[model samples]
Structure formats: structure tokens, C-alpha cells
Target: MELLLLSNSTLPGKAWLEHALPLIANQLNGRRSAVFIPFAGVTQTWDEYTDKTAEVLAPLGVNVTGIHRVADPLAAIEKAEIIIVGGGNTFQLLKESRERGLLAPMADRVKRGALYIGWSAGANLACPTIRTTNDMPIVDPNGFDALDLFPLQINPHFTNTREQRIRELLVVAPELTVIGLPEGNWIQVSNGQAVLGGPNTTWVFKAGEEAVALEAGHRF
Candidate 1:
């Protein structure tokens, strides 16, 4: 699987995806069509969210279409070459995805070689479960299960006592490792190897182990 999971979509002074544009474009490698999942954007309509993404990717020669705009969302996932999930409210993202029955098909498509990209809440959705997310539980997703594309849990836009919070969860599920990804940092998973990317340091939290701060470009 080829995946790029960013901590945040935009930098404080940069344009949308400005920090990761080259990486994203390089990952696409000429793939011209993409299917976007905008369920995470609770404050904006799906069309508006998708349009914003389309504009950013337009120069890359890729045309993005929101899954919600398609005739059959499931079929769109099956035929998708590139899957882009935007960041927003994790609860709303998971709830809508589960309700639409998109979780499984999305996993299948990405496993079959689709390039998967997500940021913030979308990054959280790529984990084993959304339990590590920082978003307040505004709504019950019925289940915390996510795409499970990447094995470890990712806490995007990391900050503050968030490490303590993740440790609390780890006490119960000690088998899991949670990665705290600060803005400007990301993880790249390719050929089954996951590595840390970007210019910021990230933290790795595991039960009974002191959280380790991984320098930029470190491999997991």
C-alpha cells in the first residue's frame, strides 16, 4: 500500500497543502483521476471541500471528484485510482463513512494499489481505531473502527497533555503504539515500511516505555 498521512493539511503561513504538494504530486506519478472523501468537513459542504482540494491538485493534472457526488459511492471506491480523505471532525467523518458502508471498500481499493492520502482527522481514520484522535466526541460513530490501513494509531496535530491521554488508552490496550504527529510532520507508508517525514519532530508513545521523540526523516 502507498499512503501519505499528514498531521495537518495546511501550514500557518502557507497555502492549502503547500508543505506536502511535491510529495503528493510525486506519489500520484501521473495518476490523473482521484476520488475524494469529504465526510470529515462538518463545517463545509462536501462540494465546497472537494472543490478546494481540486484547485490545489489541478496543476498536478489530477481531477478530483467527491464520492458523495458520484452515482454509486461504493462503486467509485472500487474503481478509484487515488483516494483522498480530508481532515475535519473525526466523529462526523467516521459516522458518515460507517453509515454509507464505505470503510471496507475503501480499505480494499487502497490495498489493491490506490494511492491513499489523508490529513488530520482523515489521518486518524487510517489507524486501527479512531480512539487516539484529539477531536471531541460530538457524535457517536457507533464504532471506533477505521480503515486500519496503517497498523499504529496516529494522533494528528499533536500538542500538550495529548501524550498522557494516549497513555491512558495504552494502559488498556498496551499492545498498541500511538504516534503523535505535530503539524508539518507526516508518515509515509510504502512497501510495508512506515517512515516519519516532514521537518518537525514526532513522538512515539507505548505503554511502560518513555515516549520517544523521533527526528525528522526517521524510520519507524
Candidate 2:
């Protein structure tokens, strides 16, 4: 299975869809593909977001669909060519997924060889659990069982700009591999290989050692 996991939204004015379309193209081996945006927030209407996604993806010759509007999201998952979950509130996204009974369907999709692309909170859910997400807990405790695709946890939006929270996460989950991925950076996992992608650096916090800096494009 292939996974394109992004840190957050790409740089402003840099068309994110343009950067993303190529990745999908490569994954699909040049075949026309369908892209799904599952995590659009409460502010934007599903139609508006899907329309914008179509505007960006159509030029690249890929069909785009909003899983949020599907009558049976699981059925859509069974037929998807590419699954792209966008950035948004983590808790809210997980809540919606649980309500829609999408967690197991998504996991099954990944296991069945669908290419999964996720950004921000979308990326966070791909980890082994949701404890590492850096968003407010707007949902109840039972509302947060994410798709446990990875063995590690990720702390997106981490930066040297905020040392206090960084230090605090170390105190809380010293045993976990708390990855610190700043904006514009991403962690890519494909065929059992994990790598860092994009412009900025990333950090991996481990027990009994200082945080290690992972350069852009470095594989684990």
C-alpha cells in the first residue's frame, strides 16, 4: 500500500492541488483516477469544497468526489481509486468518521492496495492512534477511534517556535515516537519504507535521547 501523508496545507499561493495531482498520477500508473476529500470542515459546504477540488484536479485528468456526500461512504471506499482526506479539526473529523462507520472501511481500503493521501488531521488519523493530534478535543472520548494504520504517533504543527508544548509532549509520551512535522513537510510511507517529504525538517522524539532532526527527503 502507498501513503502520501502531508503535514498541513501547502505553502500559500502554491497550488496544493497541483503538487498533489502528480503524486496521484504516479500512484495510479497514468490511469485516470478518482480522488476523495473526506474531511472538509464545518465552515465550507460539501458542494463548494468538491467543486474547488474538481477545478484543481480536472486539469490533471483525474475525477474527484466528496466522500462526505456519499449515501454509503463504505461502498464508495470499496470502489475508490484514490482516497485524499484533507486538513480540518481532528476531533470533529474523527467524530464524523465514527458516525459514518468509515473507520473499518478505510482500513480495509488501505489493506486492499488503495493509495491513501492525507493532510493535517487527515494524516494524523493514519497513525496507530489519535492521541498525538494537536487540536482541541471538541468531541467526546468515544468519538475518537481513528484508522490505526501506523504503529507510531504524530504531532503535526510542531515547531521550535513553541518549545513549551514540545517539552510537554516529551513528558507525557516518552515511550512513543512523537514525530514533530512542521508546516509544508510530510511523512511518506510506501511499501514498508517511511520517508520525509517537502521543504522543512522534522523531529522524532524518543525515550532517553534528544529529539533527532530528519532532513527533507530522508527515508527511515
Candidate 3:
């Protein structure tokens, strides 16, 4: 599996996706066509969200179309060259994915070698469950289970006080390893190896152990 999971899409004072274009371009590797999942865009229209992403990817010469526009969403996922999940509300994203019966096919196609790109809630959806997500539960996803693309849970947009909160979470669910991925940082996974990237340091949280800082380019 090749996954580019981002903590967030933008930085303060920066244009949308401006900071991550190079990373996206590197991963895309000339794959020009991509199917975007805009299910998480609750307050905005899917078309608008898709267009927003397409505009950003245009610089990389990648054409993006939303999955909602497809005649058959399942087949679209199966035949997609790239699968991109945009960030918004995690619950909404998971709810829509499950409602449309997309979770299984999305996982299957990615496991079979489709490049997967996701940001924020999109990153959370790639984890074991969305229980680690920081978004408000505006909707019921029916389940917290996610793609489980990787073994660890990711807390995107990680900041102050989140570490202690995660430790508390570990006390109840001690079997988990949570990564505190701050804004501007991302995790790249290929063949079961994951490497941290970007300008900030990431933190690793466990049940009984102290959280450790992982610097850029560090593989975990």
C-alpha cells in the first residue's frame, strides 16, 4: 500500500494545499488522473470541494473528479488510478463511505496497489478507528472502525494538551499506539514502512511509556 496521509491541508497565512504540492507531485509520479472523495465536506457542496482539490492538483498536471459524480461509485474506486480523500468532518466522511458501501472496496483497491491520498479526517479514516479523531461528532457514522490501512492511530492537527488527553485514552485502550501529527507534517507509508515528513516533530504515545518526539525523515 502507498499512502500519503497528511495532518492538515493548509498552514496559517498560506493558500490551500500550497505547502503540500511538491509532496503530492512526488507521490503522484506522473499519475495524472485521480478520483476525489468529497464525502467529508458537510458545509460545502461536493462539486465545490472537488473543484477546489482539482485546482490545487492542476499544477501537478493531475485531473481530479469527485466520486459523487461517477455513475457507479464502487466501480470507480475499483478502476481508479488514484484515490484521494479530502479532509472535513470525519464522522460525515465515514458515514457516507459506509452508507455507499465504499469502505471495503476502497480498502481492497488500495491494498491491491492504488495510491491513496488523504488529509485531516481523511488521515483519520486510514487508521484503525476514527475514535482518535479531533472532529466534533455532528453525525453518526454507525461505527468507529476505519480502513486500518496502518496499525497505529493518528491524531492530526496535534497540539497542546492533546498529549495528556491521548494518555488518558491509552489508559482505557492500552493496546493502541497513537501518533500526534501536527499541522504541516505527514506520514508516508509504503510496503508497511512509515516515514515522517515536513517541518515539525511528531510525537508517539503509548499506554505506560512516555511520549517520544519523532523528527522529520524519521521512519517508524
Cα RMSD, each candidate: 1.0, 2.3, 1.3
- Scored by CA lDDT, what does every candidate get? 0.90, 0.73, 0.89
Whole-model lDDT for model 1 versus the true structure? 0.90
Identify the superior model by lDDT, candidate 1 or candidate 2.
1
TM-score winner = 1
User: Which of candidates 1 and 3 reaches a greater lDDT?
Assistant: 1
Candidate 2 lDDT for residue 17:
54
lDDT of 2 by residue, 164-213 (tens): 56567668766667788888777777778887877777888776678788
C-alpha-based local distance difference test score of model 3? 0.89
Q: Which stretches of candidate 1 lie over 4 Å from their true place?
A: none
**Candidate 3 per-residue C-alpha lDDT over 84-191 given as tens digits, one digit per residue, 9 for 90 to 100:** 999999999999999999999999888988889999999999998998998999999999999988789999999877887898889889999999999999999866
- Residue-level lDDT of model 1, residues 1-220, one tens digit each, is 8999999999988998988788887788777778999998887899899998899898988789999899999998898888999999999999999999999999999999999999999899999899998898998999999999999999899877677789899989999999999999999887777889877778999999998999877877
Q: Look at candidate 3 and tell me the lDDT of residue 103.
A: 96
